[PDB]
């Protein structure tokens, strides 16, 4: 009752912490990937600038 | 008092869930965005390889 | 135990709140960064279409 309510609130809080932890991990991986493409574009710009007539 | 404290905590829990659901949509947009630029850079890299002398 | 448990729940709500605020900022920075790379790839694509 109070105990079931409190039990439910605890479990939902644990669910929400688990959900933000998953988002944090996916966002960390996305930011890493964006760093990788930044590198790739930079290399393509360097190339093109070196090849420029 | 118990009822007011527990109502405030339950309402906040719903508020937090809502905020995390909004950040999920944004996060998936960043994942989609990274995917689209990945494809675009790969398409350039390949063009530049194909066109080289 | 209930007042201590309630105290813990409320502290964890405040800390969830701070984590959501920090992830808002990181998402915003990540969007900005994406938009910057999109523009750079767009400029490359237009340059290449012009030299074709
Ligand atoms: Cl919560």
Q: Topology, please?
A:
Three copies of one chain form a homotrimer.
Chain A: H1 2-51
Bound molecules: chloride ion.
PDB class: viral protein
Keywords: HIV-1, oligomeric structure
Assembly: trimeric
Description:
Chain A is built from 1 helix and no strands. Chain A starts with a helix and ends with a helix. Chain A has one helix at 2-51. Chain A is rod-shaped, with a radius of gyration of 23 Å. With 53 residues, chain A is mainly α. The longest helix of chain A has 50 residues, at 2-51. Chain A has a single domain (1-53), classed as Single alpha-helices involved in coiled-coils or other helix-helix interfaces (Up-down Bundle), CATH 1.20.5.170. Chains in contact: A-B, A-C, B-C. The A-C interface holds A 2, 6, 9-10, 13, 16-17, 20, 23-24, 27, 30-31, 34, 37-38, 41, 44-45, 48 and C 2, 5-6, 9, 12-13, 16, 19-20, 23, 26-27, 30, 33-34, 37, 40-41, 44, 47. The complex binds chloride ion. Residues 13, 16 of chain A line the site of chloride ion (CL).
